[PDB]
């Protein structure tokens, strides 16, 4: 298995990211995915976006403080105001052996909505939007 | 908590948190991921109570966010345990908001809900059997399920 | 002893809340009380409030990282611009035995002042203020 | 530090801190609780110096906040040890501000002060006797009291 | 990454970070010190990979910051190992930005770069010999230097 | 060796300041220096300043969580929009013996630039600027 999508965030898991027990917890990973996914969404949407939905998720492997956490992003659909982005979470191991090993922690599809200043949906511009063109072209394969 | 449609919060209050500047995305908006984080953290308090020790998250079901939250709003996570297996515990978390930043001030609404699946683990991250003898938190959870 | 007031904040004591030694310290508790008390004050005041005063306080029991910390709020007086709120701090134990036990850590009365945009005192509105009515009605017993 | 009324800071500088965005309440205001936190943290530096180890807070006296603080202002906590008992230490903390955000820029004023009571404890949180033999920090504190 | 002058990023991506509200100075600006912090943290990931354990920073060379960064912009640190000695490792860190907050949106530029010197240390902070037998990270680093 | 300059920041090294390994790292110290140096720069500049440059630096001693960290500031030159500030970093030991000992960790010269609202350089006002006068007078000795 190889990563799919563009790299969105590459983040060290820090002590301030853990729960009270010192474990990197699922919520922190969900939060990285949402934040990272939205970078790509905003790029395509040319402005403010919000998360309207996320698909179910399974966490297959643990993450330790010190480990490097990568979020990868793949736009699957662009609607009028909505954008579906698939986010994969990959870890490069630092804290314990085998050091340097890369593994997939989870993935999920997020749906974002392009919004105006008042929080209402807006049409993603289609004219002179090369971020949208790049995304559609990638979908037209996959 | 009770909304315009007459829905009421279900379960026990896990967390009651103010949405703060340091919780927003870079644009200053309260974002899905922060809510997701609060749900997991809050759900796991209940799961750890029942499990009698360390728990990890293995699954979360799909979620929709129906209404935005502003900085300054009060954000509440309520939990109900829906299933306890050998080492697994399913907790449904509802997120309720009490409006502070914008009118109508004081309005309550439900932003989202979702079932989290947690697993009781030891120190090595290996699954462990939830203790069923003399577990008052579990008995209370199971009585709640027979009733709900 | 039972809690008195409405629940204002329910917060996990986190590693990022400790002093440099890893102890939950009195300052953090004072800070929660002030923040939590002010929620109720703002409700009644219908806008911006600041803390003008806090009564003396004693810390009777320690709090451990992992423990759940609850602030409870009881409005004792509403003046023209000032509001006195009694805050109690209760802990539900997670970190050590007995697990699940609830105890009172401290309590104190905070005085808040309703302020305008420039930091000057303003009259708390008395007309169509059901938060004020609820508070006054509770005082008329308690 | 010296204000318009001619008051001057008393004691030793414990902390010198910028009021930051992440220190505000949700409205963006620097709030009482953050100042209270800084006082306790800063006072305890002096208390730990004298006590020769771990200290906890047992009491704080009443406090008034006379003037607001803006984000960007410099906030200083000064401490004077007023009493050392067997295991207890009383530290008076004054909070001084140097104005940055708003005019008059550079003005200094005292926001609040209060006496904190700390107790020297061991690892189990049990009170311990402050060492009185060969304690230069204590000797300095006591000489300051006879004079301050 | 590729700018208007045709410069391209050199090395491996160490960190890819959003500039957040909580990273600014009190005025809300992204400041030199935060960038400096990210460079050191990111450079040390590569240094620790090669060194096979703990590393500390002993030196940083001079730096200029050519262009400001806004909150919301994506900030990337790229690293190239330039020298490995007995216990020392020199990593050049370039900071690249992808514009988000302001036009032109999506533009990439290099804010700064600088060489950090790290030292491989044990648990007591004492320098240790970087292992040269069976060190694939070191072999890769050295092959990159002979080429680049 | 004695400290030189005015005290700019006096900060406890906290757990949330460490890298993922729990070490106070050079980046955090650089960040304190830049922040602290800029206080003095803003004072003299009478408004917004940014960092355009920093000199090379060497870190001679380690800092432990719990230790007190002081940044000291000495303005070396005022140009039209630029200000050179020398920052020294001193530690008073708390975490390990000898407790109370003070040592110098590093020093470096930072160059700040006075900027307007749009990020462009502006002339530091020379009229009715007693912060500038104090700095120039200190330079005239150093
Ligand atoms: C997102 C939001 C504006 C959509 O409201 P709305 O009344 O349905 O707006 P619209 O009818 O214009 O729908 C906008 C788009 O979202 C899509 N959508 C709505 N609900 C959806 C859901 N549950 N799942 C997937 N797509 C959804 C619509 O089909 C539409 O798509 P399109 O424009 O590509 O055709 C509103 O639900 C909201 O503000 N939610 C909170 C968002 C938020 O702040 N999240 C952060 C965490 S709280
Ligand atoms: C928790 C973990 C040890 C379970 O792994 P495992 O090999 O499947 O162990 P088990 O097969 O015994 O499963 C334990 C329980 O979880 C349940 N479970 C496992 N995978 C599940 C899934 N994806 N969805 C729902 N339930 C699941 C099992 O049915 C089992 O239930 P039971 O004991 O009540 O009958 C493992 O998946 C893990 O360590 N994941 C990382 C968790 C984590 O750190 N998450 C947060 C950040 S990544
Ligand atoms: C709060 C503040 C506006 C009051 O200033 P002021 O000149 O006394 O204003 P007023 O005379 O209008 O007094 C306002 C109310 O506060 C009350 N008050 C003033 N000082 C008080 C004190 N020490 N204790 C209790 N109440 C007090 C007054 O009696 C009056 O009450 P009322 O309107 O119900 O009759 C001013 O002291 C201030 O801005 N302080 C700093 C507040 C702050 O920012 N705190 C956060 C931590 S720094
Ligand atoms: C510190 C603590 C062990 C002291 O408890 P204790 O049973 O009263 O122990 P002692 O009776 O020996 O009191 C120790 C000293 O504190 C003083 N003291 C106790 N309570 C006090 C009070 N409420 N106000 C002022 N001084 C007080 C005593 O007079 C005694 O003084 P001395 O040794 O100088 O003569 C205890 O109260 C505690 O652990 N509280 C929690 C502290 C804490 O964690 N606070 C921060 C967050 S909750
Ligand atoms: C600082 C900045 C405005 C200067 O741009 P500029 O086009 O050179 O502006 P100027 O020509 O007016 O130069 C302004 C001053 O800086 C000085 N300066 C410029 N580059 C310098 C450098 N590398 N080292 C020292 N001084 C420098 C100039 O000599 C001039 O000094 P003076 O007014 O006292 O005579 C621009 O480089 C910038 O915005 N950089 C990013 C700053 C930033 O945001 N840093 C935070 C971390 S990213
Ligand atoms: C790392 C440290 C142990 C090295 O100290 P030392 O007594 O000089 O040890 P050494 O003489 O063996 O030097 C180790 C290596 O660093 C190099 N080095 C030392 N000082 C240097 C300097 N100031 N500039 C560039 N390289 C330097 C040496 O040349 C040597 O290289 P080599 O092993 O590849 O041949 C020490 O300086 C230290 O603990 N400093 C604190 C580091 C720290 O905590 N920084 C972050 C926050 S303060
Ligand atoms: Ca290896
Ligand atoms: Ca809180
Ligand atoms: Ca109302
Ligand atoms: Ca029990
Ligand atoms: Ca600071
Ligand atoms: Ca002036
Ligand atoms: Ca991040
Ligand atoms: Ca564009
Ligand atoms: Ca000593």
Q: Scanning the structure block, which residue is given the tokens 């650089």?
A: F30
* Residue F68: closest C-alpha in chain C: C20
Among C11, C13, C14, C15, the residue to mutate for chain A (most A Cβ within 10 A):
C15
Task: From C82, C117, C119, give the residue whose CB has the most ligand 3 atoms within 8 Å, as the site to mutate.
Answer: C82
Instruction: Kindly list the protein residues that place their beta carbon closer than 5 angstroms to ligand 10, a single-atom ion.
Output: C 99
Question: What is chain E's Cα-based Rg?
Answer: 16
Per the CB < 8 A criterion, the answer to whether D89 and D130 are in contact is yes
Burial class of residue D117, CB neighbours in 10 A (0-12, 13-18, 19+) = buried
Residue nearest to atom 29 of ligand 4 (CA): D88
Min Cα separation F17/chain D (Å):
15
Residues of D in contact with F68 (CB under 8 A): 45
Other residues' Cβ atoms within 10 Å of the Cβ of residue A63: 24
First to last CA, chain A: 16
Residues of F in contact with A14 (CB under 8 A): 20
d(CA E37, CA E55): 15
Residue nearest to atom 46 of ligand 4 (CA): C26
Q: And the tokens for A15?
A: 């002590």
Per the CB < 8 A criterion, the answer to whether D127 and D120 are in contact is yes
d(CA D110, CA D113): 8
Q: And the tokens for A88?
A: 């994969």
Q: Using a threshold of 3 CB pairs under 8 A, tell whether chains D and A touch.
A: no
* Cross-strand partners of A10: A70, E16
E11: left (phi over 0), alpha (psi -120 to 50) or beta: left
Flag if E18 and B26 touch (Cβ within 8 Å): yes
Find out whether the beta carbon of A69 lies less than 6 Å from any atom of ligand 2: no
Find out whether the beta carbon of B68 lies less than 6 Å from any atom of ligand 1: yes
E39 sits in which H/E element? helix E32-51
CA angle A90, A91, A96 (to 5 degrees): 160
In sign, the C-alpha dihedral spanning C132, C134, C139, C140 is: positive
Burial class of residue C121, CB neighbours in 10 A (0-12, 13-18, 19+) = middle
Other residues' Cβ atoms within 10 Å of the Cβ of residue A122: 18
Residue nearest to atom 20 of ligand 2 (CA): B58
CB pairs < 8 Å spanning A and F: 14
Q: And the tokens for F135?
A: 């700095």
d(CA A52, CA F89): 48
CA distances from C129 to C110, C133, D141 (A): 21, 6, 53
All residues at 6 or more sequence positions from A24 whose CB lies less than 8 Å from its CB, including other chains: A13, A17, A18, A62, A63, A64, A65, A67
CA distances from B102 to A118, B21, B98, B99, B106 (A): 12, 16, 10, 7, 9
CA angle D17, D18, D23 (to 5 degrees): 100
d(CA F40, CA F138): 13
Other residues' Cβ atoms within 10 Å of the Cβ of residue D66: 9
d(CA E9, CA E98): 12
CA angle E91, E25, F122 (to 5 degrees): 95
* Residue B18: closest C-alpha in chain D: D26
How much of chain C is helix, strand and coil, in % rounded to 5? 25, 35, 40
Min Cα separation B55/chain E (Å):
30
How much of chain E is helix, strand and coil, in % rounded to 5? 20, 40, 40
Residues of D in contact with E22 (CB under 8 A): 21-22
Residue nearest to atom 9 of ligand 1 (CA): A121
Rounded (10°) angle between helices A26-45 and A130-139: 120
Task: From D30, D31, D65, D97, give the residue whose CB has the most ligand 3 atoms within 8 Å, as the site to mutate.
Answer: D65
The total number of residues written for chain A in this structure: 142
* Cross-strand partners of E76: E16, E96
Per the CB < 8 A criterion, the answer to whether E68 and F119 are in contact is yes
The number of the ligand 3 atom at minimal distance from the alpha carbon of D64 is 23
Per the CB < 8 A criterion, the answer to whether C141 and C76 are in contact is no
Per the CB < 8 A criterion, the answer to whether A34 and B36 are in contact is yes
B119: left (phi over 0), alpha (psi -120 to 50) or beta: beta
Phi, psi for residue F114 in degrees, rounded to 5: -70, 125
Q: Scanning the structure block, which residue is given the tokens 């009490």?
A: B98
Find out whether the beta carbon of B36 lies less than 6 Å from any atom of ligand 1: no
B28 alpha carbon to ligand 9 midpoint, in Å?
A: 25
Find out whether the beta carbon of A25 lies less than 6 Å from any atom of ligand 2: yes
d(CA A113, CA A123): 9
B100 alpha carbon to ligand 9 midpoint, in Å?
A: 10
Min Cα separation D25/chain B (Å):
7
CA distances from D38 to B41, B64, D16, D23, E128 (A): 28, 40, 10, 11, 40
Per the CB < 8 A criterion, the answer to whether F48 and F114 are in contact is yes
The number of the ligand 5 atom at minimal distance from the alpha carbon of E64 is 23
Per the CB < 8 A criterion, the answer to whether F42 and F48 are in contact is yes
How much of chain F is helix, strand and coil, in % rounded to 5? 25, 35, 40
Residue D120, preceding bond cis, omega within 30 degrees?
no
Task: From D43, D120, D127, give the residue whose CB has the most ligand 4 atoms within 8 Å, as the site to mutate.
Answer: D127
F96 alpha carbon to ligand 15 midpoint, in Å?
A: 10
Task: Provide the 3-class DSSP secondary structure of residue E62.
Answer: coil
All residues at 6 or more sequence positions from A120 whose CB lies less than 8 Å from its CB, including other chains: none
| Pairing outcome for strands A68-78 and A82-92 | antiparallel
Longest dimension (CA), chain D: 50
Reported resolution in A?
A: 2.0
* Cross-strand partners of D103: none
Q: Scanning the structure block, which residue is given the tokens 């079901």?
A: B61
CA-nearest of B56, B24, B38, B54 to B113 is B38
How much of chain B is helix, strand and coil, in % rounded to 5? 20, 40, 40
CA distances from B128 to A18, A132, D56 (A): 21, 48, 37
d(CA D34, CA D85): 29
Question: What is chain A's Cα-based Rg?
Answer: 16
In sign, the C-alpha dihedral spanning F111, F120, F48, F137 is: positive
How much of chain A is helix, strand and coil, in % rounded to 5? 25, 35, 40
Q: And the tokens for F96?
A: 């390990």
B77 sits in which H/E element? strand B74-84
Min Cα separation A116/chain B (Å):
13
Q: Scanning the structure block, which residue is given the tokens 């004792």?
A: C76
Per the CB < 8 A criterion, the answer to whether F109 and F55 are in contact is yes
Flag if F50 and E68 touch (Cβ within 8 Å): yes
Judge whether C56 is closer than 8 Å to chain D, CB to CB. Answer: yes
- Selected residues 65-84 of chain D with any CB under 8 Å from a CB in chain F: 74
In sign, the C-alpha dihedral spanning D45, D48, D52, D55 is: negative
CA-nearest of F46, F35, F34 to F108 is F34
d(CA D101, CA D103): 7
Residues of B in contact with C46 (CB under 8 A): 105
Phi, psi for residue E69 in degrees, rounded to 5: -125, 140
C123: left (phi over 0), alpha (psi -120 to 50) or beta: beta
Q: Scanning the structure block, which residue is given the tokens 């000064």?
A: D78
Q: Scanning the structure block, which residue is given the tokens 């579906």?
A: A84
d(CA E25, CA C62): 34
Find out whether the beta carbon of B55 lies less than 6 Å from any atom of ligand 1: no
In sign, the C-alpha dihedral spanning A134, A136, A137, A141 is: positive
Other residues' Cβ atoms within 10 Å of the Cβ of residue C19: 25
d(CA F69, CA F34): 14
Phi, psi for residue E136 in degrees, rounded to 5: -65, -35
* Cross-strand partners of B111: none
CA-nearest of F48, A32, A48 to E101 is A48
Query: Where do the domains of chain D lie, and which CATH numbers do they carry?
Result: 1-148 (3.10.129.10)
Judge whether F27 is closer than 8 Å to chain A, CB to CB. Answer: no
Longest dimension (CA), chain B: 50
CA angle F137, F141, F142 (to 5 degrees): 110
Task: Provide the 3-class DSSP secondary structure of residue F82.
Answer: strand
First to last CA, chain B: 18
Min Cα separation E78/chain A (Å):
12
D103 alpha carbon to ligand 12 midpoint, in Å?
A: 8
d(CA D13, CA D96): 10
Per the CB < 8 A criterion, the answer to whether F28 and F36 are in contact is no
C141 alpha carbon to ligand 3 midpoint, in Å?
A: 27
d(CA B39, CA B100): 20
Q: What is the DSSP string of A106-137?
A: EEEEEEEEEB-TTS-B-PPP-TT-HHHHHHHH
Q: Using a threshold of 3 CB pairs under 8 A, tell whether chains A and E touch.
A: yes
All residues at 6 or more sequence positions from B1 whose CB lies less than 8 Å from its CB, including other chains: B8, B9, B76, B78, B96, B98, B108, B110
Task: Provide the 3-class DSSP secondary structure of residue E108.
Answer: strand
Residue D9, preceding bond cis, omega within 30 degrees?
no
D108 sits in which H/E element? strand D108-120
d(CA E104, CA E67): 13
d(CA E79, CA E117): 12
CA-nearest of B41, D46, F14, D43 to C23 is F14
D119 alpha carbon to ligand 4 midpoint, in Å?
A: 6
Find out whether the beta carbon of D67 lies less than 6 Å from any atom of ligand 3: yes
Find out whether the beta carbon of C80 lies less than 6 Å from any atom of ligand 3: yes
Residues of D in contact with C56 (CB under 8 A): 59-62
d(CA F27, CA C63): 32
Per the CB < 8 A criterion, the answer to whether E120 and E127 are in contact is yes
All residues at 6 or more sequence positions from C103 whose CB lies less than 8 Å from its CB, including other chains: C61, C90, C91, C93
Q: What is the DSSP letter of F16?
A: G
D121 sits in which H/E element? none
Per the CB < 8 A criterion, the answer to whether A56 and B70 are in contact is no
Q: And the tokens for B53?
A: 């020790």
Experimental technique of record: X-ray
Burial class of residue C95, CB neighbours in 10 A (0-12, 13-18, 19+) = middle
CA-nearest of B49, A38, F73, A3 to D16 is F73
Min Cα separation E29/chain F (Å):
9
Flag if C15 and A21 touch (Cβ within 8 Å): no
d(CA A27, CA A18): 10
All residues at 6 or more sequence positions from D90 whose CB lies less than 8 Å from its CB, including other chains: D81, D82, D83, D84, D115, D116, D117, D118
CA-nearest of F31, F88, F101 to F60 is F88
First to last CA, chain F: 16
Judge whether A52 is closer than 8 Å to chain B, CB to CB. Answer: yes
Q: Scanning the structure block, which residue is given the tokens 């009259």?
A: C123
CA distances from C22 to C96, C135, E109, F14 (A): 15, 38, 41, 9
Q: Which ligand is nearest to the CA of E85?
A: 6
């Amino acid at each position: 298995r190889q990563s799919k999508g563009v790299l969105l965030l590459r983040t060290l898991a820090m002590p301030s990211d853990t729960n009270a027990n010192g474990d990197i917890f699922g919520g922190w990973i969900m939060s990285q995915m949402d934040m990272g996914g939205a970078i790509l969404a905003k790029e395509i949407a040319h402005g403010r976006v919000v998360t309207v939905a996320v698909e179910s998720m399974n966490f297959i492997k643990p993450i330790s403080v010190g480990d490097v956490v990568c979020c990868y992003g793949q736009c699957l659909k662009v609607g009028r105001s909505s954008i579906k982005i698939k986010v994969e979470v990959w870890v490069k191991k630092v804290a314990s052996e085998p050091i340097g090993e890369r593994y997939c922690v989870t993935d999920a599809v997020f749906t974002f909505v392009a919004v105006d200043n008042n929080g209402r949906s807006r049409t993603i511009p289609r004219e002179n939007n090369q971020e949208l063109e790049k995304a559609l072209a990638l979908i037209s394969e996959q």
